[PDB]
């Protein structure tokens with residue numbers, strides 16, 4: 074039993090809710106919140122900008138030190154950093170950004186990072202300002218992630234479309 078509330082069950086291990094991931098993280102304080110990161114961990118907008126703002130920029134400060142030490146992530150890759158006031162840990166995962174021309178096949182590799190964590194609160198990778206089709210992202214999630222994932226979808230209209238079209 075866990076503390077996630079109001080989710081629709083899509084499969085054995087995938088759950089979905091119309092929710093602001095920032096507000097959901099603040100309330101649940103999950104072990105892991107996933108950030109929709111880029112390779113530079115520059116948290117300017119979308120989910121990343123929102124999560125970073127909620128940490129009062131502490132996420133960005135920590136991320137800048139990480140990059141100065143380790144260099145950029147790979148597209149499809151991830152790193153574990155602090156969850157600050159939102160979660161125990163933040164798993165920064167880089168989905169391909171279609172608006173940069175990155176290969177959508179890398180979306181499966183990106184979701185594979187979730188399998189290293191038993192339970193996660195996450196957005197749909199490569200959705201929103203990353204330019205991929207969120208219906209496709211949900212399909213890849215369901216077909217790739219085997220651990221327990223609670224997906225927060227900010228837009229109510231999109232949430233209803235994702236549920237109604239789910240196979």
Ligand SMILES: O=C(O)C[C@@H]1CN(c2ncnc3[nH]c4ccccc4c23)CCO1
Nearest residue numbers: 094119120123196200201202226227228
């Ligand atoms: O899910 C969707 O419809 C949109 C997807 C997923 N993203 C989010 N997901 C879940 N919570 C989110 N709070 C946010 C606050 C500010 C900006 C983006 C978000 C945001 C956004 C990018 O694309």
